[PDB]
Amino acid sequence: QLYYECYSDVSVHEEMIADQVRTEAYRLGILKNWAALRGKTVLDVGAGTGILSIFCAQAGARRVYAVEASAIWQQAREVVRLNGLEDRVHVLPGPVETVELPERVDAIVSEWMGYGLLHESMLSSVLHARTKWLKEGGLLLPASAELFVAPISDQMLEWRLGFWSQVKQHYGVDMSCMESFATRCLMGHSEIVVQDLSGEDVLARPQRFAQLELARAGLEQELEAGVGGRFRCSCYGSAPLHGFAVWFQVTFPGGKPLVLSTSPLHPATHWKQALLYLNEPVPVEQDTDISGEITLLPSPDNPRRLRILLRYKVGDHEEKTKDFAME
Amino acid sequence: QLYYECYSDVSVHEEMIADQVRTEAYRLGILKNWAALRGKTVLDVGAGTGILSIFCAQAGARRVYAVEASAIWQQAREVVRLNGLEDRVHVLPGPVETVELPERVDAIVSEWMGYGLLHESMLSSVLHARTKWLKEGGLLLPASAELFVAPISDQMLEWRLGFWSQVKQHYGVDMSCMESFATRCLMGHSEIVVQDLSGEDVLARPQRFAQLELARAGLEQELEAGVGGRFRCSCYGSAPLHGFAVWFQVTFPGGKPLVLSTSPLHPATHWKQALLYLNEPVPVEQDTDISGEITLLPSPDNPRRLRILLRYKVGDHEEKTKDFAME
Ligand SMILES: Nc1ncnc2c1ncn2[C@@H]1O[C@H](C[C@@H](N)CC[C@H](N)C(=O)O)[C@@H](O)[C@H]1O
Ligand SMILES: Nc1ncnc2c1ncn2[C@@H]1O[C@H](C[C@@H](N)CC[C@H](N)C(=O)O)[C@@H](O)[C@H]1O
């Protein structure tokens, strides 16, 4: 039969739906808001395969507009039909910025978050839709996002760097000189690295450095100018500091609020964490103070390519700056 | 400090050295040939970080020429110095096709194998070096390669395809229509897929379909015209046939010969297996006959980009052909 070039399309959506933490958080977050959704109209921004739109219908929404710009909208329409909802869930192809709805809506639901929250995220589209299509006093799901940072001693990176000095003990050949080379290569760059960590990697109490209430005035301008803030923490114990991890949570309006977290201390998600490596490891001790500032920015070529500007000071070392971008 | 673009370089060599099966097979394969190497000269084709050249010195080689074309040759020279072998192991940058050695050699050692044995493999370079630099009656390590094929029921692919029909049981939304879409996307292409399998995936006894004795007359021409052969087998039981896996082993001349295998039935290696998916699954039963022909070819744009031409016949279905390439 025929050959197709949609491996990427299915794999992205499989990854999302198989993310139990993500998909169940949205299912429950939507269901917990049934009193606000029942008999009401909803706009699903970036509906993908349509599953959130169907969750909304199941929570009692009268009508759902499922807007999806990629080729996958066709599958969403099939999914809607298969669940017998073609009369109340309407799949509309194209960007939400130019879609034509027949009415303003009572609520917007969207899974818009990207790596590091803002990489290739749909947030500006959600905000555009809010301004254009959401009724006054209308509901946004989720309602807010919080950003966190922690210093890390990445156990996998420590193993990769230390590997070369262990070759002698396994094969009888000294390769310890490869360590400086591996350090330059794995850390001496300014790329944001997406990797999953666990609590074993966290070197101080995670710090909330920003909060975004998605309905708030001025957020579109804050995104352009940079989202972020200062942080300070104290190290748990002796370890090589490799840099910092950034992650987020989003919060659904209450029925306590339901929180979808991407912390390394919480169940893994497909978002993992966004890692900001220093150029080389820095030894730290118990109670070493670390302070800094983290700003999430658009890239100049592309506002949806995430840039992170890090200022940091470890102990009595002078403040340093490192300017990262997603690749 | 400075930023570098060598993440790829360290990661490739880390992967090789951390492949215990590979690295220990070469260590032992070389050591088992100490009587042939002792007091002799060796050419290491594609020396990388230099570890095989040092194994040769440790097996008693008088002199080793370590030829490496990529930037990593510099690290090999440092590794040699660190192990006190600068007097007998000489690292020479550039392709082996144009390197100038001061003498012909008694032996060639090389880790030349690529994915599917011949993707981006150094074999033609090894053969060039054999012709130009190896003394008559000289030793090649490894000495031979064998190629295997088996029909597979890929358990991970079965799960990915069947995932969509299971969404209803986990989230209350029917997405079974996504299955045809996922099948077209994941199987309806002609790319060779590199993936690790296990015995749970093997649907019939693996078949050897070719053997390459690396010293033999005419091998360079066989590589250009295509390496391969016919196979026949009978299925173990009822399962979806997804296609075929191809893998290899290489054999070191004897001190029984030491074999480095990349079979899914044997310890995993970084080579994994090369998977050839049909356009859609084919149901088979116990004792379903499967026959075919497999040919490994150069690509027209690039002789080192692997092409695999598959002819296959499942049961009483007509013979089919599918022409694959590495991406
Ligand atoms: N401006 C836009 N308008 C419409 N769709 C968009 C836009 N930007 C991104 N998308 C789509 O938004 C979807 C984002 C997904 N994270 C969410 C998929 C789906 N809602 C789910 O939760 O499984 C993707 O399918 C993108 O193709
Ligand atoms: N024609 C060539 N001449 C010299 N080096 C080559 C050539 N083709 C490939 N290479 C290098 O060959 C090496 C192949 C590696 N598989 C082996 C590395 C090393 N011998 C090891 O076993 O760890 C890589 O470092 C390639 O850069």
XYZ file of C-alpha atoms and ligand atoms in Angstrom:
708
model
C 0.000 0.000 0.000
C 0.890 3.704 0.213
C 3.649 5.366 2.239
C 2.929 8.215 4.619
C 4.991 10.756 6.558
C 3.000 11.072 9.794
C 5.107 9.042 12.234
C 5.779 12.280 14.100
C 2.119 13.262 14.277
C 0.970 9.995 15.894
C 3.966 9.830 18.237
C 3.382 13.313 19.661
C -0.257 12.558 20.413
C 0.478 9.085 21.721
C 2.984 10.640 24.112
C 0.369 13.102 25.421
C -2.455 10.610 25.871
C -0.149 7.994 27.424
C 0.953 10.641 29.933
C -1.415 9.465 32.648
C -0.535 12.302 34.989
C -1.388 14.882 32.329
C -4.458 13.262 30.895
C -6.021 12.309 34.238
C -5.330 15.787 35.644
C -7.259 17.324 32.793
C -10.047 14.748 33.010
C -10.523 15.430 36.720
C -9.867 19.156 36.457
C -12.612 19.428 33.896
C -14.985 17.140 35.758
C -14.462 19.099 39.009
C -15.721 22.158 37.165
C -18.916 20.492 35.938
C -21.117 23.003 37.799
C -19.421 25.796 35.836
C -19.530 23.910 32.509
C -22.971 22.299 32.605
C -25.198 23.630 29.839
C -22.446 26.080 28.838
C -20.246 26.553 25.758
C -16.521 25.792 25.627
C -13.643 26.601 23.338
C -10.854 23.958 23.311
C -7.765 25.750 22.068
C -5.454 23.299 20.301
C -7.782 20.354 20.503
C -5.365 17.811 19.003
C -7.075 14.406 18.916
C -10.125 15.935 20.659
C -9.946 14.142 24.011
C -10.266 17.282 26.166
C -13.241 18.449 24.137
C -14.936 15.152 24.785
C -14.110 15.407 28.514
C -15.886 18.777 28.479
C -18.948 17.317 26.790
C -18.945 14.524 29.369
C -18.813 17.161 32.134
C -22.052 18.552 30.724
C -21.031 21.267 28.241
C -23.829 22.171 25.864
C -21.482 22.832 22.997
C -17.750 22.592 22.458
C -15.690 24.209 19.711
C -12.528 22.198 19.155
C -10.009 24.278 17.240
C -6.883 22.581 15.920
C -4.346 23.908 13.448
C -2.351 20.763 12.614
C -3.334 17.892 10.333
C -4.548 15.902 13.352
C -7.851 17.828 13.405
C -9.213 15.201 11.003
C -8.684 12.483 13.599
C -10.407 14.639 16.243
C -13.478 14.833 14.031
C -13.504 10.994 13.735
C -13.062 10.652 17.524
C -15.978 12.994 18.111
C -18.188 11.011 15.731
C -17.176 7.706 17.297
C -18.287 8.942 20.721
C -21.629 10.119 19.324
C -20.946 13.821 19.961
C -21.024 15.259 16.448
C -24.097 17.304 17.440
C -22.360 19.162 20.286
C -18.602 19.045 19.617
C -17.537 20.864 16.467
C -13.986 20.486 15.156
C -12.669 23.568 13.362
C -9.366 23.454 11.484
C -6.850 26.298 11.422
C -5.332 28.639 14.016
C -7.605 29.871 16.778
C -6.458 33.405 15.908
C -8.537 33.320 12.706
C -11.260 30.746 13.400
C -14.882 31.929 13.169
C -17.136 30.779 15.987
C -20.875 31.464 15.882
C -20.895 32.707 19.492
C -18.682 33.786 22.382
C -17.998 31.038 24.901
C -18.389 30.538 28.627
C -15.089 28.736 29.056
C -11.764 27.986 27.471
C -9.939 24.726 28.062
C -6.417 24.218 26.708
C -3.354 22.077 27.169
C -0.951 24.764 25.980
C 2.154 24.115 28.036
C 5.481 23.384 26.457
C 8.895 22.290 27.693
C 10.025 24.790 30.299
C 6.366 25.884 30.263
C 6.858 28.369 27.436
C 8.768 26.566 24.670
C 6.521 26.263 21.612
C 3.629 26.776 23.960
C 0.241 27.840 22.784
C -0.146 30.417 25.648
C -0.270 33.487 23.392
C -2.985 31.757 21.353
C -4.994 30.986 24.465
C -4.722 34.619 25.521
C -5.767 35.795 22.061
C -8.813 33.514 22.229
C -9.624 34.749 25.737
C -9.708 38.339 24.519
C -11.678 37.582 21.377
C -14.083 34.797 22.318
C -14.411 34.397 26.086
C -17.442 35.986 27.757
C -16.854 38.405 30.599
C -16.309 36.492 33.807
C -15.678 33.341 31.788
C -13.631 30.364 32.942
C -10.079 29.331 31.910
C -8.892 25.761 32.515
C -6.291 25.572 33.850
C -6.446 29.001 35.486
C -2.817 29.593 36.535
C 0.763 28.375 36.160
C 3.643 28.517 38.607
C 7.336 28.251 37.784
C 9.968 26.627 39.989
C 13.734 26.406 40.034
C 16.147 24.245 42.029
C 19.877 23.738 41.972
C 20.742 20.213 40.869
C 23.420 17.587 41.154
C 22.366 15.514 38.164
C 23.219 11.929 39.004
C 23.145 10.763 35.400
C 25.444 13.609 34.302
C 27.767 12.876 37.246
C 27.954 9.280 36.041
C 28.651 10.327 32.432
C 31.423 12.688 33.445
C 32.943 10.225 35.905
C 32.661 7.326 33.455
C 35.983 8.015 31.816
C 37.886 7.848 35.117
C 36.267 4.458 35.762
C 37.390 2.815 32.492
C 40.701 1.813 34.091
C 38.806 -0.200 36.747
C 36.748 -2.062 34.139
C 39.043 -2.510 31.137
C 42.588 -1.770 32.323
C 42.954 1.349 30.192
C 43.246 4.780 31.739
C 40.919 7.257 30.071
C 40.682 9.831 32.868
C 41.872 12.515 30.452
C 38.538 12.171 28.597
C 36.823 13.790 31.597
C 37.747 17.384 30.757
C 36.695 16.686 27.169
C 33.368 15.226 28.211
C 32.743 18.165 30.569
C 33.339 20.741 27.819
C 31.091 18.814 25.493
C 28.199 18.028 27.823
C 28.176 21.287 29.824
C 30.114 23.861 27.796
C 27.182 24.961 25.667
C 24.163 27.208 26.087
C 21.375 24.793 25.122
C 18.450 24.087 27.404
C 18.392 20.313 27.989
C 15.095 18.510 28.548
C 15.699 15.585 30.897
C 13.812 13.847 33.681
C 15.242 14.124 37.177
C 14.143 12.764 40.543
C 14.516 13.921 44.112
C 18.000 12.411 44.216
C 19.058 15.231 41.875
C 17.604 18.175 43.827
C 20.259 20.019 45.851
C 18.142 22.590 47.705
C 14.511 23.354 48.379
C 12.801 24.238 45.096
C 11.842 27.886 44.829
C 8.771 29.353 43.151
C 10.073 32.265 41.061
C 6.959 33.252 39.135
C 3.204 32.859 38.964
C 1.029 33.487 35.951
C -2.678 34.011 36.457
C -3.824 33.454 32.918
C -6.810 35.847 33.095
C -4.753 38.766 34.382
C -4.351 42.094 32.603
C -0.981 42.607 30.972
C 0.142 38.999 30.719
C 0.693 39.151 26.936
C 3.156 42.015 27.488
C 4.864 40.222 30.373
C 5.483 37.249 28.061
C 7.183 39.494 25.507
C 9.296 41.303 28.144
C 10.170 38.164 30.139
C 8.579 36.057 32.846
C 10.616 35.371 35.901
C 12.089 36.449 39.162
C 14.759 36.136 41.792
C 15.435 33.097 43.957
C 17.567 32.126 46.916
C 18.251 28.777 48.557
C 20.690 26.814 50.698
C 22.269 23.515 49.647
C 21.341 20.252 51.377
C 24.846 18.795 51.407
C 28.139 18.160 49.647
C 27.849 17.525 45.947
C 28.857 18.825 42.557
C 26.470 21.555 41.491
C 25.750 21.087 37.785
C 23.272 23.868 37.343
C 19.544 24.359 37.743
C 16.295 22.667 36.838
C 13.180 24.605 35.888
C 9.684 23.172 35.933
C 6.096 24.204 36.336
C 2.699 23.366 37.663
C -0.715 24.430 36.480
C -3.774 24.753 38.689
C -7.412 24.132 37.808
C -10.063 26.349 39.436
C -11.627 24.537 42.403
C -14.666 22.270 42.452
C -8.856 22.119 46.984
C -7.609 23.079 43.519
C -6.296 20.282 41.356
C -2.641 20.762 40.477
C -0.786 19.237 37.560
C 2.895 19.266 38.498
C 6.040 18.499 36.522
C 8.331 18.551 39.551
C 11.047 15.919 39.782
C 9.661 15.162 43.220
C 6.295 14.212 41.704
C 5.204 11.524 39.225
C 6.987 11.801 35.894
C 5.332 13.523 32.942
C 6.303 13.890 29.332
C 7.372 17.477 29.993
C 10.259 16.226 32.166
C 12.246 19.282 33.417
C 14.291 21.975 31.659
C 17.922 21.788 32.733
C 20.341 24.719 32.733
C 23.853 23.436 33.045
C 26.782 25.527 34.207
C 29.928 25.307 32.061
C 31.484 22.953 34.607
C 30.555 21.536 37.981
C 30.969 23.666 41.096
C 31.595 21.929 44.387
C 29.113 22.926 47.119
C 28.659 22.032 50.785
C 25.797 21.840 53.245
C 24.327 25.315 53.643
C 26.121 26.816 50.647
C 23.983 29.777 49.634
C 22.842 30.050 46.046
C 20.895 32.998 44.731
C 20.005 34.247 41.303
C 17.445 35.397 38.792
C 15.718 33.427 36.093
C 13.913 34.981 33.128
C 11.938 33.099 30.455
C 12.008 35.001 27.160
C 11.051 34.701 23.512
C 13.875 34.158 21.029
C 14.427 37.058 18.587
C 13.931 34.824 15.504
C 10.916 33.084 16.983
C 8.900 34.101 20.025
C 7.915 30.485 20.626
C 11.511 29.263 20.893
C 12.302 29.485 24.587
C 15.216 31.493 25.880
C 16.240 31.443 29.543
C 18.544 34.050 31.006
C 20.163 32.862 34.220
C 22.027 35.007 36.711
C 23.444 33.045 39.621
C 25.780 33.349 42.571
C 27.133 30.312 44.374
C 28.481 30.979 47.842
C 31.182 33.625 47.812
C 31.914 33.220 44.094
C 31.032 36.244 41.975
C 27.723 36.461 40.187
C 27.705 34.869 36.768
C 25.365 34.983 33.836
C 24.496 32.365 31.258
C 22.052 32.832 28.385
C 20.351 29.626 27.264
C 18.068 28.665 24.421
C 16.132 25.656 23.323
C 17.596 23.949 20.252
C 34.234 29.914 29.821
C 33.965 28.961 26.137
C 31.159 27.092 24.371
C 31.825 24.003 22.294
C 29.859 21.885 19.822
C 31.130 18.378 20.613
C 28.231 16.904 22.598
C 27.736 14.448 19.744
C 31.384 13.414 19.632
C 31.582 12.470 23.330
C 28.169 10.785 23.322
C 29.018 8.477 20.415
C 32.226 7.322 22.074
C 30.644 7.045 25.500
C 27.985 4.811 23.965
C 30.637 2.515 22.447
C 32.831 2.211 25.527
C 29.832 1.759 27.847
C 28.683 -1.093 25.596
C 30.174 -3.803 27.786
C 29.308 -6.578 25.369
C 31.142 -4.814 22.543
C 34.126 -3.574 24.457
C 34.746 -6.801 26.390
C 34.373 -8.872 23.209
C 37.104 -6.854 21.573
C 39.298 -6.909 24.677
C 39.072 -10.699 24.890
C 39.134 -11.244 21.137
C 42.371 -9.333 20.944
C 43.862 -10.959 24.021
C 42.992 -14.450 22.705
C 45.122 -13.651 19.678
C 48.174 -12.619 21.705
C 50.318 -15.383 20.164
C 49.587 -13.900 16.730
C 50.087 -10.283 17.871
C 53.100 -10.569 20.170
C 56.065 -8.633 18.812
C 54.052 -7.805 15.675
C 52.682 -4.604 14.117
C 48.999 -3.657 14.014
C 46.864 -1.178 12.152
C 43.736 -0.032 14.069
C 41.340 1.246 11.437
C 39.081 3.925 12.917
C 40.772 4.052 16.272
C 38.338 6.516 17.871
C 39.419 7.137 21.473
C 42.237 4.579 21.028
C 41.036 1.847 23.389
C 41.416 -1.031 20.902
C 44.912 0.115 20.012
C 45.840 0.009 23.658
C 44.285 -3.472 24.001
C 46.576 -4.562 21.160
C 49.635 -3.117 22.867
C 48.599 -4.898 26.062
C 48.327 -8.158 24.083
C 51.982 -7.704 23.164
C 51.999 -5.820 19.842
C 55.356 -4.249 19.095
C 53.830 -1.272 17.370
C 50.317 -0.062 16.684
C 49.205 2.518 14.133
C 45.941 4.079 15.257
C 44.287 5.831 12.336
C 41.276 8.039 13.012
C 39.596 10.507 10.691
C 37.321 12.411 13.093
C 38.267 15.121 15.578
C 38.444 12.515 18.358
C 41.937 11.432 17.242
C 43.316 14.133 19.551
C 41.784 12.407 22.564
C 43.238 9.063 21.419
C 46.702 10.603 21.443
C 46.135 11.817 25.053
C 44.834 8.358 26.061
C 47.912 6.730 24.574
C 50.211 9.107 26.456
C 48.336 8.591 29.714
C 48.877 4.831 29.475
C 52.592 5.307 28.785
C 52.430 3.913 25.235
C 53.508 6.903 23.158
C 56.598 4.933 22.072
C 54.632 2.061 20.507
C 51.143 3.369 19.671
C 51.108 6.115 17.060
C 47.913 8.066 16.386
C 47.559 9.252 12.792
C 44.769 11.636 11.804
C 42.849 11.432 8.533
C 41.230 8.645 6.503
C 43.031 5.319 6.383
C 42.719 5.485 2.583
C 45.393 8.207 2.457
C 47.422 7.707 5.643
C 51.156 7.021 5.246
C 52.519 4.226 7.408
C 56.254 3.521 7.538
C 55.707 -0.232 7.097
C 53.141 -2.876 6.183
C 51.471 -4.494 9.176
C 50.959 -7.997 10.501
C 47.386 -7.404 11.598
C 44.403 -5.140 11.272
C 41.964 -4.598 14.113
C 38.783 -2.581 13.561
C 35.373 -1.976 15.040
C 33.777 -1.085 11.712
C 30.238 -2.360 12.085
C 27.255 -0.106 11.741
C 23.519 -0.437 12.303
C 22.299 -3.341 10.208
C 26.011 -4.198 9.945
C 26.571 -2.020 6.886
C 25.023 1.385 7.629
C 27.790 3.995 7.775
C 30.153 1.135 8.390
C 33.845 1.420 7.863
C 34.040 -2.008 6.074
C 35.170 -0.623 2.707
C 37.925 1.281 4.525
C 39.053 -1.845 6.333
C 39.185 -3.692 3.023
C 41.135 -0.854 1.415
C 43.639 -0.979 4.284
C 43.874 -4.767 3.999
C 44.830 -4.493 0.339
C 47.271 -1.646 0.843
C 48.905 -2.276 4.213
C 48.341 -5.832 5.438
C 51.166 -8.332 4.918
C 50.401 -11.534 3.064
C 48.859 -14.038 5.431
C 48.149 -11.235 7.890
C 45.424 -11.262 10.527
C 42.055 -9.418 10.536
C 40.174 -8.923 13.813
C 37.354 -9.708 13.706
C 37.735 -12.131 10.801
C 34.121 -12.658 9.669
C 30.552 -11.392 9.984
C 27.279 -13.271 9.729
C 23.862 -11.789 9.019
C 20.578 -13.050 10.454
C 16.910 -12.396 9.862
C 13.791 -13.361 11.814
C 10.130 -12.547 11.483
C 8.934 -10.488 14.436
C 5.850 -9.663 16.424
C 7.154 -6.483 18.017
C 5.540 -6.266 21.429
C 6.190 -2.553 21.818
C 4.702 -1.806 18.381
C 1.709 -4.041 19.183
C 1.174 -1.983 22.329
C 1.461 1.326 20.439
C -1.020 0.258 17.796
C -3.431 -1.231 20.324
C -3.127 1.766 22.650
C -5.851 3.730 20.940
C -8.420 0.944 21.367
C -7.581 0.878 25.084
C -8.237 4.592 25.740
C -11.936 3.874 26.311
C -11.030 1.506 29.186
C -8.807 4.098 30.872
C -10.443 7.465 30.189
C -13.981 6.758 28.962
C -13.341 8.095 25.469
C -13.369 5.832 22.447
C -10.350 6.423 20.241
C -10.285 3.086 18.409
C -10.450 4.942 15.095
C -6.904 6.227 15.762
C -5.625 2.675 15.201
C -5.718 2.759 11.397
C -4.053 6.175 11.555
C -1.328 4.968 13.879
C -0.734 1.894 11.692
C -0.274 3.994 8.540
C 2.060 6.300 10.388
C 4.204 3.774 12.239
C 4.351 1.065 9.543
C 3.364 2.705 6.252
C 6.829 3.969 5.397
C 10.026 2.505 3.989
C 12.502 3.538 6.697
C 14.702 1.032 8.470
C 13.987 1.384 12.205
C 16.728 0.726 14.752
C 15.142 -0.700 17.896
C 16.060 -3.257 20.533
C 13.979 -6.418 20.678
C 14.078 -9.488 22.903
C 13.148 -13.114 22.450
C 9.518 -12.250 23.162
C 9.486 -10.521 19.761
C 10.966 -13.350 17.665
C 8.292 -15.279 15.747
C 10.367 -18.037 14.129
C 13.843 -19.487 14.320
C 16.346 -16.859 13.172
C 17.948 -17.658 9.841
C 21.513 -16.936 8.758
C 21.209 -15.428 5.268
C 24.786 -14.362 4.602
C 28.366 -14.745 5.751
C 31.214 -12.392 5.003
C 34.758 -13.636 5.405
C 36.529 -10.317 5.458
C 39.770 -11.579 3.853
C 38.013 -13.167 0.887
C 38.577 -12.212 -2.742
C 35.777 -10.204 -4.292
C 34.136 -8.891 -1.141
C 34.447 -5.223 -2.181
C 32.449 -6.028 -5.333
C 29.879 -8.053 -3.398
C 29.274 -5.016 -1.167
C 28.574 -2.834 -4.201
C 26.283 -5.431 -5.843
C 24.477 -6.422 -2.625
C 25.064 -8.764 0.286
C 22.329 -11.167 1.128
C 20.394 -14.291 0.450
C 17.207 -16.270 0.713
C 15.571 -17.481 3.913
C 12.718 -19.706 4.987
C 11.134 -20.339 8.373
C 7.993 -21.488 10.161
C 6.138 -19.411 12.755
C 6.101 -20.426 16.425
C 2.476 -19.502 17.067
C -0.420 -17.104 16.602
C 0.548 -13.467 16.512
C 0.532 -10.375 14.358
C 3.522 -10.430 12.048
C 4.934 -6.901 11.889
C 7.886 -7.580 9.678
C 11.468 -8.718 10.095
C 14.498 -7.996 12.225
C 18.028 -8.093 10.851
C 21.135 -8.384 12.982
C 24.674 -9.633 12.852
C 27.512 -11.275 14.657
C 31.231 -10.988 14.134
C 33.750 -13.698 14.938
C 37.332 -13.327 16.134
C 39.908 -15.874 14.923
C 40.463 -18.532 17.599
C 42.988 -18.545 20.428
C 36.400 -21.843 20.249
C 36.111 -18.556 18.354
C 34.837 -15.586 20.297
C 31.595 -14.240 18.871
C 30.179 -10.766 19.329
C 26.443 -11.040 18.700
C 23.714 -8.430 18.350
C 20.868 -10.943 18.428
C 17.757 -10.058 20.402
C 18.220 -13.393 22.128
C 21.620 -12.289 23.450
C 22.745 -9.454 25.743
C 21.795 -6.037 24.411
C 24.317 -3.920 22.519
C 24.224 -0.398 21.218
C 23.666 -1.720 17.699
C 20.208 -2.997 18.716
C 18.550 -4.596 15.628
C 17.423 -3.226 12.255
C 13.668 -3.585 11.871
C 11.842 -3.886 8.552
C 8.179 -3.272 9.084
C 5.471 -4.390 6.695
C 2.870 -1.751 5.786
C 0.424 -3.343 8.221
C 0.348 -6.377 10.466
C -0.358 -9.799 8.982
C -1.965 -12.411 11.181
C 0.003 -15.686 11.324
C -0.503 -19.046 13.027
C 1.685 -21.836 14.332
C 3.605 -23.314 11.412
C 2.783 -20.514 8.978
C 5.563 -20.633 6.404
C 7.480 -17.469 5.654
C 10.138 -17.263 2.989
C 11.946 -14.447 1.285
C 15.144 -12.767 0.224
C 17.050 -10.005 1.924
C 19.691 -7.861 0.221
C 21.844 -5.188 1.895
C 22.811 -2.494 -0.612
C 24.466 0.899 -0.868
C 22.193 3.884 -1.467
C 22.684 5.603 -4.855
C 23.444 9.006 -3.248
C 25.728 7.503 -0.633
C 27.183 4.007 -0.547
C 27.384 4.146 3.241
C 23.660 4.802 3.688
C 22.141 1.357 4.063
C 19.404 0.131 1.784
C 17.622 -3.179 2.362
C 15.536 -4.817 -0.324
C 13.084 -7.320 1.121
C 11.121 -9.903 -0.818
C 8.796 -11.961 1.347
C 5.967 -14.453 1.158
C 3.759 -15.203 4.136
C 1.830 -18.446 3.919
C -0.309 -18.601 0.805
C -0.281 -14.828 0.271
C 1.540 -13.692 -2.860
C 5.144 -12.603 -2.721
C 5.626 -8.954 -1.898
C 8.527 -6.583 -2.104
C 9.472 -3.632 0.054
C 12.521 -1.420 -0.455
C 13.850 0.141 2.743
C 16.494 2.700 3.569
C 18.078 4.150 6.634
C 17.041 7.749 7.318
N -2.718 28.718 17.400
C -3.206 27.411 17.411
N -4.452 27.167 17.020
C -4.949 25.949 16.980
N -4.257 24.895 17.362
C -3.010 25.042 17.805
C -2.427 26.327 17.835
N -1.156 26.171 18.329
C -0.955 24.893 18.609
N -2.054 24.166 18.268
C -2.288 22.736 18.492
O -2.509 22.638 19.923
C -2.369 21.273 20.355
C -1.665 21.283 21.713
C -1.642 19.947 22.461
N -0.699 20.172 23.562
C -2.985 19.601 23.118
C -3.682 18.478 22.347
C -5.011 18.058 22.994
N -5.791 19.196 23.513
C -4.710 17.146 24.146
O -4.764 17.589 25.279
O -4.389 15.867 23.892
C -1.535 20.579 19.274
O -2.368 19.599 18.646
C -1.148 21.725 18.293
O -1.232 21.330 16.940
N 38.001 5.841 6.559
C 38.245 6.065 7.914
N 39.485 6.286 8.335
C 39.763 6.536 9.597
N 38.836 6.545 10.532
C 37.566 6.300 10.214
C 37.219 6.058 8.867
N 35.864 5.842 8.844
C 35.392 5.920 10.078
N 36.398 6.235 10.939
C 36.331 6.330 12.401
O 36.218 4.950 12.836
C 35.757 4.894 14.197
C 34.789 3.714 14.315
C 34.378 3.330 15.738
N 33.273 2.385 15.546
C 35.468 2.557 16.493
C 36.113 3.448 17.557
C 37.180 2.706 18.377
N 38.011 1.800 17.565
C 36.486 1.880 19.420
O 36.369 0.681 19.241
O 36.013 2.489 20.519
C 35.069 6.237 14.458
O 35.838 6.933 15.444
C 35.105 6.960 13.079
O 35.410 8.334 13.198
